[PDB]
Amino acid sequence: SSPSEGLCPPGHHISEDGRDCISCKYGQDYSTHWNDLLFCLRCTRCDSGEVELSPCTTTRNTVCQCEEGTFREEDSPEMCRKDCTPWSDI
């Protein structure tokens, strides 16, 4: 709750007054780096067709991955396009 040289540890955020380092609620926000954000980066949420592969830690966003049967790719990270893997077609 004290900024080591203006920054605050990962999982917290600076204050308006600039004094304390408040932490990011679980599965609602976070900071995976030493920051000075007046707010903690909101957490992503997976949607049907996506299976949560990893909790949104207070210092690591949630990781979502296509359901079984569908994959993503670097040019199509917006929707899960129907051997097959979670990042490649068969």
């Binding site: 954000l37 980066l41 957490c43 992503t44 917006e78 929707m79 129907k82």
Partner: protein, 152 residues
């Protein structure tokens, strides 16, 4: 003294009157939405100062569709931006529409819709966005938003 405002959808971040009004915007201040000399109430920005206002909004229609059985599948994704002024009924300001692909092989749909225009508004006038197929909207904050700002 700045009169502007940008409010996004709630629900969270993205992976790392006709229609149906949208009230689920975020009335607070965050790292992506603010309210300056204006305010949200029921999903309606409420005008404090009168003047010309550039008003925009983006609505993300996303869906992972399957050609259902006992129904047609053509979709009219439309976004309306009405205003309530000293007059009983809501009055449309703008509207933008899209139609889902007609192909029988359409596995899915991504249709972000953005629109905007200047309009004269007076104190206590209120504006809001309304949309068709609201169950198909993606309210991640970077995807769907609504805002307006004075000009002159």
């Amino acid at each position: 003294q700045r009169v502007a405002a940008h409010i996004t959808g709630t629900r969270g971040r993205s992976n790392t009157a006709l229609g149906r009004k949208i009230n689920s915007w975020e009335s607070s201040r965050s790292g992506h939405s603010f309210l300056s000399n204006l305010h949200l109430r029921n999903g309606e920005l409420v005008i404090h100062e009168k003047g010309f206002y550039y008003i925009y909004s983006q609505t993300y229609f996303r869906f992972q569709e399957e050609i259902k059985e006992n129904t047609k599948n053509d979709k009219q994704m439309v976004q309306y931006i009405y205003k309530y002024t000293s007059y009983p009924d809501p009055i449309l300001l703008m509207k933008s529409a899209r139609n889902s692909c007609w192909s029988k092989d359409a596995e899915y749909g991504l249709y972000s819709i953005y629109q905007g225009g200047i309009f004269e508004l007076k104190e206590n006038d209120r504006i809001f966005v309304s949309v068709t197929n609201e169950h198909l909207i993606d309210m991640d904050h970077e995807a769907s938003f609504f805002g307006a700002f004075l000009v002159g």
